[PDB]
Amino acid sequence: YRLKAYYREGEKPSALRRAGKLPGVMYNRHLNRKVYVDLVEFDKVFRQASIHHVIVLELPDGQSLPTLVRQVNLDKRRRRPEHVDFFVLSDEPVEMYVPLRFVGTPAGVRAGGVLQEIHRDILVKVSPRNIPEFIEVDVSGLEIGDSLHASDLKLPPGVELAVSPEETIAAVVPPEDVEKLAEE
Amino acid sequence: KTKADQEKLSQALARLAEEDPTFRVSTHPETGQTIISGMGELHLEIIVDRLKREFKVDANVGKPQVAYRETITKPVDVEGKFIRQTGGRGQYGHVKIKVEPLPRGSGFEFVNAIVGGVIPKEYIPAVQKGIEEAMQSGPLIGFPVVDIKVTLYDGSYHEVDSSEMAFKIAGSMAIKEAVQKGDPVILEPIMRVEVTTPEEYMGDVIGDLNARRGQILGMEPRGNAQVIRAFVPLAEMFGYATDLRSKTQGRGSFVMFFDHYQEVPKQVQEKLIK
Amino acid sequence: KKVVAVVKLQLPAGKATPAPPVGPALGQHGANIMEFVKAFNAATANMGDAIVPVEITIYADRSFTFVTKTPPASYLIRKAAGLEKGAHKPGREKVGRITWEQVLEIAKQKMPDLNTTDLEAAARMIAGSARSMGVEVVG
Amino acid sequence: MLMPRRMKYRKQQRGRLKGATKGGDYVAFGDYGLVALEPAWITAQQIEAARVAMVRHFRRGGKIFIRIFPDKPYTKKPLEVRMGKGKGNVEGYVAVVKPGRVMFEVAGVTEEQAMEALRIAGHKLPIKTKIVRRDAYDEAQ
Amino acid sequence: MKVRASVKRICDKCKVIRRHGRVYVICENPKHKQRQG
RNA sequence: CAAGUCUGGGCUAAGUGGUAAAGGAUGUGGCGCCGCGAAGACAGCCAGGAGGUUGGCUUAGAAGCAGCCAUCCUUUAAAGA
Ligand SMILES: [Zn+2]
């Protein structure tokens, strides 16, 4: 991914919104410079890209660094990304959220109930070198009942989860059934 | 109307039934009210003028009632006690039974389930005539509580106080309550009908019958016509002539027979609480 | 003296009554509505059940004719699995089964009807009717 | 219905509704959600009326999450009575909802159904609402 | 479904007309024949 | 009723203006993204629109067309169990 971004002198971070552009700022343990990018192209990329796949930013200084949207603050009353936070990756291993891929239909798929993505994103770590992706999770032998969590999964050539493990990644629960009444 | 007219009416047919034996008079064997057998709307209609005019009788003209039945769903077991010990004709009778619903069309079955003889030999006849009896007025509306099996599996007694009768009551109590307890259900009458109709009209013929709480059963062709069989409730079956002859401009004819009794759609349960 | 016909009725095995649709369509046929319950149940006295399609054609002198097709592809498959009824809910519940050959054997029995002139294609029409009645294919 | 089970104070003051939402302005659970456009007081009944018809519409469907929770005592003096004499008794409860707040959200259902059950819900509610999907609702801890 | 405040399409064959500043809605089944008011 | 029927650009066609809400709408202008695009599209005409097979279960009977499921195959230019 790419994204045209420019430096900001620091003048009217709100005159940019009205302008049309989204005020930003990228950084890391070395440098932090205030920036800003157009929305169109940020919706169009963040809409997809998100915080799983890196975004190489192109600045007027030839540079085109790799970063992960560590944070996107909103406008609550009407959601409109109002300011990002690009973390400039390096070589040093750093933490991010790798997407989980539920590949396999469980038993609640014939019985009933619903797969619950109680946590479709895990906090692992690894050198920006190894850019893993959808970390497949196995499902099938699951029926409206217990579930699975911990770190029971295919951890690529260097990924070393930074959660617990213990956090309930996902579970299957009882469907809502019209004919059900408890009040009385 | 008042028993007064109930007479002018007797004479009504006493001469009208000779001047036209193309009808039939019948006293509903279950509820006083009398039926007036006709051969088409108009028929009974114009009798209603003469029988009311040239006989000056002035009664009511609504529709027949339905011979309902009472029964239950769940099997129950309750105590039948009586005892009245104050000083002499003690009156001491008491029994326990096993009430259990039977298939809609089972009948009446009791069970002499007494081991050694905790309940003397001579008193069982009467403890039955008591149960058999009580079943007369249902727990819901008061109709022949039927389609069940009864089991007398216990009950004690007293050497001097007991009586043939004292037991007929105790047993008439055990029953008078098992039905109240086993969740009652207002059964009703279902008929067998066969409308002979040219499959021309058939289409709606079947429809109309469906929208009559009835459920269709078949149509094996006949002559140039075609016959339809099915069940229906006598309530939603009144004045059918002038309804069949409607969906058929006259080319329609039917018969009718009884079959079984069956639960009312609940919505018709609280309906009948009259 | 009624007019002519290529009647495409659909009568089962055994039930041969002059009763419609063997009446309105074969009333302009002069059809021996009873030279079927004999000519048919003679050849199908072997099978026993299964419907048998038929095309009864009339002419001028008031005579008829009729050629029959094969029994539903769902028939031979019910006996070839100890079945009678499908499986109520196809797919998830298997109540019997047919091998990769037992399907390729049936596609032979009805190959002169479908359309394809193969078996890798024909058999699939059979293997398709497998999940149509919940009868997996032994493989 | 729904409501607090215990309480330190049986009665509490009105207060005023402002903008913002303070939180719960993002998904986090289901796949599709319904959000408030105007600020207000949703009664327990209002909620229930919805949650129900919500489920009703898709008999045997996925899971519905009521992301809001009433807990503000609704007061009311008896009918035909003058001012004073203290406060009023409780009537029901309400949850103070503000714009940008995710009121409910469904999980595990065809989009067609999700976008419908929600549409109905919105009708039982006294305020205008929007149906959101799940894009940038990533990371909001 | 003649006069009303919420006039909509009750089956594809319906058509949202607007003759005379009034949103009418016509179809093949005289039942859908609406009109806002 | 004292002082511009003032100048340049834009919207509104109900007298809106000249005081009301949810909720309706091919209103009317204006920005947008995303599909099909003359290796023939939109409306369009004449065409075909099938055979396994009335899929299986259920039912009085369900044959694409109550309703459960299931949704594979086929000969094709293409035709959904
Ligand atoms: Zn319409």
How helical, in percent, are the residues of chain A?
under 10%
Characterize the main sheet of chain A. 4 strands, mixed
The largest β sheet of chain D comes out as: 4 strands, antiparallel
- Widest sheet of chain A: strand order? 3-7-6-5
User: Which kinds of small molecule does this entry bind, naming each only once?
Assistant: zinc ion
CATH architectural category of chain D: Alpha-Beta Complex
Strand/helix succession of chain A: EHEEEHEEEEEEEEE
Q: CATH superfamily of chain D, called what?
A: Ribosomal protein L16/L10
Q: Count structural domains of chain D.
A: 1
Proportion of helical residues of chain D: 10-25%
Main sheet strand line-up of chain D: 3-6-1-7
Order of helices and strands of chain D: EEHEEEEHE
Largest interface: A-D, 27 and 26 residues
- Please give the radius of gyration of chain D in angstroms: 17 Å
User: Beta-strand level of the residues of chain D, as a percent range?
Assistant: 25-35%
Computed over alpha carbons, the radius of gyration of chain A is: 21 Å
Based on secondary structure, the structural category of chain D is: alpha+beta
Provide a descriptive summary of the structure in words.
Chain A: This is one of 3 proteins that mediate the attachment of the 5S rRNA onto the large ribosomal subunit. This is part of a larger assembly, with chains A (184 residues), B (274 residues), C (139 residues), D (141 residues) and E (37 residues). Chain A is mainly β and 184 residues long. Helices cover 7% and strands 33% of the residues of chain A. Chain A has helices at 15-19, 40-46; strands spanning 5-7, 21-23, 26-27, 35-38, 55-58, 64-73, 83-88, 94-103, 114-116, 121-126, 135-138, 147-148, 170-173. A four-stranded mixed beta sheet of chain A has the order 3-7-6-5, with no helix packed on it. Chain A has a three-stranded antiparallel beta sheet with strand order 1-4-2. Chain A has a three-stranded mixed beta sheet with strand order 10-8-11, with no helix packed on it. In chain A, 22% of the residues are buried. Chain B is α+β, with helices and mostly antiparallel strands and 274 residues long. Helices cover 26% and strands 21% of the residues of chain B. Chain B has helices at 5-16, 41-50, 124-134, 164-181, 199-210, 241-244, 269-272; strands at residues 24-27, 34-37, 79-81, 94-101, 108-109, 148-154, 188-197, 215-218, 226-233, 256-262. In chain B, the strands form three sheets. Chain B has a four-stranded mixed beta sheet with strand order 3-4-6-5. A four-stranded antiparallel beta sheet of chain B has the order 8-9-7-10. Chain B has a two-stranded antiparallel sheet with strand order 1-2. The longest helix of chain B is centred in the middle third of the chain and has 18 residues, at 164-181. Chain B is elongated. In chain D, the strands form two sheets. In chain D, strands 3-6-1-7 form a four-stranded antiparallel beta sheet, covered by helices on one side. Chain D has a three-stranded antiparallel beta sheet with strand order 2-5-4. In chain D, helix 1 runs antiparallel to helix 2 (111-124). The longest helix of chain D is centred in the middle third of the chain and has 14 residues, at 44-57. Chain D is elongated. Chain E has 37 residues and is mostly beta strands. Chain E is built from no helices and two strands. The complex binds zinc ion. Zinc ion is lined by residues 10-11, 13-14, 27, 29, 32 of chain E. The structure holds one RNA strand of 81 nucleotides.
